[PDB]
Amino acid sequence: VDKSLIKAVKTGKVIVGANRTIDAAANGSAKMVVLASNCPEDIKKKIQATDIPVLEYEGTSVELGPVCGKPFTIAAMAILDVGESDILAATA
RNA sequence: AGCGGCGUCGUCGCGCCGUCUAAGCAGCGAACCCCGUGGAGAGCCGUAAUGGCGAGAAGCGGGCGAAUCUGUAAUGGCAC
């Protein structure tokens, strides 16, 4: 998993940031959304109800970035193309 | 700089004063803040400075929003 999570971004389409993740969930192009332990649910329960799967990450948005190669923090990380990976299978 | 007085004037052409205009009414609105887009990292954008940023930067549109300024208030006062 330690390498599958990296390869999901190394050889896969993802969009980082809550705004773009919510847009991807709204328009359906995202296979799923990965959310950190600190992300609220006031807007997120709607995308939970929607057919877009919601994966929960084991750590905060601060440390979700370094494991996905981003120097910044990531809260919502909707994926577009799984690519050379089965992160969707890992989620559900 | 122009204009109108006063002063000086042994030589010079300088020195001084004035050359005005309220509130109200109407118009614009800097910063901050907010809204819509945007997607920025072997990093970018700022400030006098501290800083800001995928929990969404820059850039681009909109809204809100000052002092003051502009007109009007004009046929007032001034050696009209």
Rounded Cα–Cα distance for residues A17 and A47 (Å): 15
- Consecutive H or E run containing A67: helix A61-67
Resolution of the determined structure in angstroms stands at: 3.5
Rounded Cα–Cα distance for residues A67 and A32 (Å): 18
Rounded Cα–Cα distance for residues A52 and A29 (Å): 9
Rounded Cα–Cα distance for residues A8 and A46 (Å): 25
Backbone angles phi, psi at A39, to 5 degrees: -85, 130
- Consecutive H or E run containing A47: helix A44-49
Please state whether strand B lies within 7 Å of residue A80 at its CB atom: no
What's the CA–C1' distance between A59 and B47, in Å?
A: 35
What's the CA–C1' distance between A29 and B9, in Å?
A: 97
Shortest CA to C1' contact from A61: nucleotide: B55
Please state whether strand B lies within 7 Å of residue A72 at its CB atom: yes
Backbone angles phi, psi at A74, to 5 degrees: -130, 130
Please state whether strand B lies within 7 Å of residue A61 at its CB atom: yes
Shortest CA to C1' contact from A19: nucleotide: B56
C-alpha distance across the termini of chain A, in Å: 14
